[PDB]
Every structure is written in structure tokens, then in C-alpha cells.
Amino acid sequence: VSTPELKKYMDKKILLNINGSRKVAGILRGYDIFLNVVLDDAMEINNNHQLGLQTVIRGNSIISLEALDAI
Template sequence: MVAVPELKQYLNNQIKVELNGNRVVQGKLAGYDFFLNLTMSDCVEVKGPKTNPEYIQLGQSVIRGNSIINIELI
């Protein structure tokens, strides 16, 4: 039996999501579904070194669950 992701406690909180292809996005979790597809508001992509990152505004974004490697509350 497959369990539904337990992300209810993270709704409306800032999260950082690591995606395949060494991409990182962060924003406010607005929703999710059974397949771990995420809807994020105020989303930005983080590029560059951690000491001086570049932020690219994405706005409202939908992230497919099969591209997610890690989710972190920030």
C-alpha cells in the first residue's frame, strides 16, 4: 500500500526543493497531491555558489513529483 505524502504541516511555509539536473527552487508551498506534485507561490530558482547565489523569479510554479530529489523546510 502506498502512503499519501505528509506535507500538510508544511502548507503556507517556505520550502527549498532540490530537483534533478542540479536545480534548486524555493518558495511557499501552496498545495500538493498524491504523486508529490507541488504547487508553489513566490517561487525562485537559486543558481550559483552558496556564498553569492543568483535568484531568478518564477512566480507561481507547479513541480512534478518525479523530478523531486529532496524537500527541506527553510
Template sequence: MADRGRGAARGGRGGSNIKRPMGGPQAAQNADKPRREAILDLSKYVDERIRVKFTGGREVTGILKGYDQLLNLVLDDVTEELQLPHPHIRSLGLTVLRGPTITVLNPVDGSEEIANPFAAAEQ
């Protein structure tokens, strides 16, 4: 009576003794599919300073050290630019940024503000 619900034979927590094949038709289909590649090629921005904006409005800049196909980023020498309640900058150091939360990614060097060509000219 004390062993109730504890055996693998009764469907308890114990591991299953059923051996499943490692190959089969499903494995053959997966081998034929092309490997999924990253949407963006960030290799040219490694060791360059980039700016990252997140959902919710947070914004950081740092030196790109690594990334993966899900756009998770590793940045070094990261600074966060806070706007509220008053503008200031705080240092975060080495940081891992989750890809699903990133909305904008751009290099800091080589980008500059230009005049809006669609704005109405003042007279």
C-alpha cells in the same frame, strides 16, 4: 470503393458498438483495496516556505500552496538559485513542480547548518 476502411463494422476508426459491463469481479476487487495514500504528509507545511531540489541539480524555494499524492507541488513566490556560470537568483512566481523530478524537500524555517560531527578534528 470510396468508403474503404471507414466503417466501424470493418474495424476502422468508428466507435465499437459492444457494450461492456461497468461492474463485475474486477470492480469488486478494486473496491476492497485500501486507497493509496501519500508517502509524505505535507499538510503541516502548507503556507510555509520550503526548499526543493531536483534531479539534475536545480534548486528552488517557495511557499507551498498545494500538493497531491504523487508529490506534484504548487509553490508561490518561487525563486530559483542558479550557480553556474555565476551565482544569482531569478524569480519564477507561481509554479507547478512535478513530483517524479523531486529528490529533496525540506522546510526553510527551522533548518540551520550544523558542524559535521564526522569530520576529523583539526589539531
């Protein structure tokens, strides 16, 4: 329908809180109309253990997607 306005967050480090407790930081690579996001070089902030080279996050469990860069 309407693609979310994330064309300015491309290839910039962001930190988004999975569900209500987890917080994942990575480099955004793409997104879908459901607000699914694929972010590379993830790191589960808590010491903090990396996730993998390429992860996808279902847009249902995303709450906020604040960006840790110039934007």
C-alpha cells in the same frame, strides 16, 4: 492511495532541489498523491531569478524537500 504527510509544511517556505542540479525555493500551496507540488513566489537559487507567481512541479523530478522555517 496514501496522501504524503506534508500537512505541516503548508504555507511555509521550503527549498527543494529539482532534478540533481537545480534548487527552487518558494511557499508551498498544495500537493497531490504523486507528490506534485504547487508553490507560489518561486526563486531559482544559484543573481537568482524569480520564476513566476504560480508554478507546479512534477513529483517525478523532486528529490528532497527540506524546509527553511520553524516547522
